Design a protein around this ligand. Structure first.
Ligand SMILES: [Zn+2]
Lengths: 233, 9, 227
């Protein structure tokens, strides 16, 4: 969990946005301006990232629920696979508004969702109508899109790992209102004050995003190793 | 890609 | 032929909880962790490889291998594997005297096959009067265990057992008659009378299929080389 200060360099972590869209709070992590862009200071970046990795690793050891948030369509697919690979569930695209707080109200929603899935191999064959059938399938699709990937939790998650943060400012606000710790790949235009582990990367190119996903994925497997057995053969 | 020396500077 | 990467995936290294363990198996164990014993896979393969060589040797002289898998989980798995290699199997209780008491069990198999045809042909039907029900249900019970060895197989030349404790009754009769035995001994099973031994997790569905694969492979290979 000490990704070479050079691997990210080729990934694209150094290229932020332009000044026209630059969070002034991010000054501590600036190196200059290539073609009026803002090159994140990787040397400043890297200790924080590795530190959060360790933090997140001890979490998974205590068996604290982790979570990830979907972003752009490419990001969402990548997040899903990495999450499904181990555990820790995952959001997809919308964050379903006030999921946190209204977690009890969306719990009833999850209940109805699972029933429909179960009754999707039951109610479909019997009493099928050219009208009701389309109803069932379509609603399930919509529900699945976002609610799917969270239905497993069956309770309040104990951590969150979002990306960019700005695109999901709503998610961070609710998490701050409960104590649930979070991690965010803040970029040159993202308010990091609400984050407890500022990862000053770049939510872009996917390439670099895939690096962050791969990294954390590895740390949570170390947590599972403490939950299963040590390395040997 | 930019040289490591300039990047580290 | 199996590799360390093969087993490491299946989980063969996983061993029963600390409390349950026969200290006689300590050599085959590496380092216990998280109140669970971790088999020393490094030792597993060298012996498993030797045993696969031996199984090939047997099948050369067209010997009869018998697979024993009472465990409900692996029971169906053992059934499927024994088909590909056409060797005998027993996926239910190892009826006492299965070997030692051969005369009795042999008469039983005779009864079975005779009942089989009669009912299969349809004779049973005409009889009805609840007597047809009796003979069909008797076939079911007999086949539930006796099935797999019906085609003779008197005094096999080897027994492959998934567990080295649950089937202690089998691991004994064979010793009395001098029939070599093999077993996927775990950490809670006595390493006695097993002769060629194989430290391996006998619980996980993943690992049992691994063992079945390799053993079935070598057995048919041996038949082919003699052919
Ligand atoms: Zn960005």
């Amino acid at each position: 969990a000490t990704v070479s200060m050079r691997d990210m360099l080729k990934a694209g972590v150094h290229f932020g946005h332009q000044t026209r869209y630059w969070n002034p709070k991010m000054k501590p992590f600036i190196f200059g301006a290539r073609n009026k862009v803002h090159i994140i200071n990787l040397e400043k970046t890297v200790p924080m990232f590795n530190e959060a990795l360790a933090e997140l690793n001890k979490i998974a050891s205590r068996k604290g629920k982790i979570l990830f948030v979907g972003t752009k369509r490419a990001a969402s697919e990548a997040v899903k696979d990495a999450a499904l690979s181990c555990d820790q569930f995952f959001v997809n695209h919308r964050w379903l508004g006030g999921m946190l707080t209204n977690w009890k109200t969306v719990r009833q929603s999850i209940k109805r969702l699972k029933d429909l899935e179960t009754q999707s191999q039951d109610g479909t064959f019997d009493k099928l109508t050219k009208k009701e059938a389309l109803m069932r399938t379509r609603e399930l699709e919509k529900l699945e899109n976002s609610l799917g990937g969270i239905k497993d939790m069956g309770g309040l998650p104990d951590a969150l790992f979002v990306i960019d943060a700005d695109h999901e400012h709503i998610a961070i606000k609710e998490a701050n209102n409960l104590g649930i710790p979070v991690f965010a790949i803040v970029d040159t235009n993202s308010d990091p004050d609400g984050v407890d582990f500022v990862i000053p990367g770049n939510d872009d190119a996917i390439r670099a995003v895939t690096l962050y996903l791969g990294a954390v994925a590895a740390t949570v497997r170390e947590g599972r190793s403490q939950d299963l057995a040590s390395q040997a053969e | 890609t930019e040289s490591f020396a300039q990047l580290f500077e």
